[PDB]
């Protein structure tokens, strides 16, 4: 998992991505209160993080070297033999991971929730994988509404995204799903100062991703669907 009264999510609460306001729902899941919870594709939120942390070759505000970052994380490991027929029990061809953020209608009473999933793919067809993935959103949304049921926590929207890789023969794959909980450095906050903590957060809340990018002199790494997971 959760992020609640103490948090904001990059791409949604701060450095909001235009793709978020433009995003159209994929479908809806019924909640305990009878309201229909719209499910979206978490690509906008995924790209956003890349824009802030930067990449390995184009590093920006990534976590400090050796820092301790608590993360609502999960993952899965699977092996793919050298084309062997007997694939043993838990082995496979591909490995996938998913992450879902559900925002609470009343952030002062209920916490937003993260639901993560991961698994192994047994068939060799990547294209067939994508179908399964689109199908997982249903599975996840199902658990989401179920969890809300448990705490009577109503959400307004939910964003789900996926990641995967297909192994070459004799290769092992690791698909991870992680949500880091960090604190922001001053030089990432335009007109920010260590002496103006709360204002700092407000600046970030008011700046949209592009505005930030431009104000910082950063090119857009998400560009036009340039990022793939």
């Amino acid at each position: 998992x959760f992020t609640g009264v103490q948090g904001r999510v990059i791409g949604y609460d701060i450095l909001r991505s235009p793709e978020v306001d433009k995003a159209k729902p994929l479908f809806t899941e019924t909640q305990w209160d009878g309201s229909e919870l719209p499910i979206y594709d978490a690509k906008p939120l995924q790209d956003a993080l890349v824009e802030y942390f930067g990449t390995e070759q184009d590093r920006r505000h990534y976590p400090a070297p050796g820092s301790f970052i608590v993360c609502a994380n999960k993952g899965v490991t699977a092996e793919r033999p050298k084309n062997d027929a007997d694939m043993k029990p838990g082995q496979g061809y591909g490995v996938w991971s998913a992450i879902a953020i559900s925002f609470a209608k009343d952030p002062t009473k209920d916490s937003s929730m993260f639901v993560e999933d991961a698994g192994v793919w047994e068939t060799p067809n990547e294209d067939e994988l994508l179908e399964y993935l689109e199908g997982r959103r249903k599975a996840m949304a199902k658990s989401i509404a179920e969890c809300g049921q448990d705490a009577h926590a109503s959400f307004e929207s939910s964003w789900i995204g996926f990641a995967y890789t297909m192994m070459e023969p004799g290769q092992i794959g690791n698909a991870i799903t992680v949500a880091p909980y960090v604190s922001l450095p001053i030089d990432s906050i335009p007109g920010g100062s260590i002496l103006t903590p709360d204002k700092d957060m407000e600046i970030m809340e008011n700046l949209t991703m592009p505005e930030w990018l431009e104000k910082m002199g950063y090119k857009s790494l998400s560009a036009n669907n340039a990022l793939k997971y």
């Binding site: 103490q6 948090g7 976590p63 991971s97 992680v178 880091p180 909980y181 960090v182 604190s183 997971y229």
Partner: protein, 81 residues
């Protein structure tokens, strides 16, 4: 935002500032200013040619994934569930 105003009245604040240059820091680390946190979404996968070491294979693959796309390379990852 107007939400923070309501939050503050509860004694809660979403302030999360890092005192370092360039880098972000993890929630709860000493020296951070504020009692809140910021989060994001990251899903990635990495691979490695199999060796006779299940552990090491997991390590590296779980490192190529951390370094792919959104960088969180040399991080001490603590788990929350």
């Amino acid at each position: 935002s107007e939400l923070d105003a309501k939050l503050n009245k509860l004694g809660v604040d979403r302030i999360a500032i890092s005192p370092y240059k360039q880098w972000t820091r993890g929630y709860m680390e000493p020296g951070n200013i504020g009692n809140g946190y910021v989060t994001g979404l990251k899903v990635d996968a990495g691979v490695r040619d199999k060796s006779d070491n299940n552990v090491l294979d997991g390590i590296v693959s779980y490192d190529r994934a951390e370094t792919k796309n959104a960088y969180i390379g040399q991080i001490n990852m603590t788990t929350a569930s």
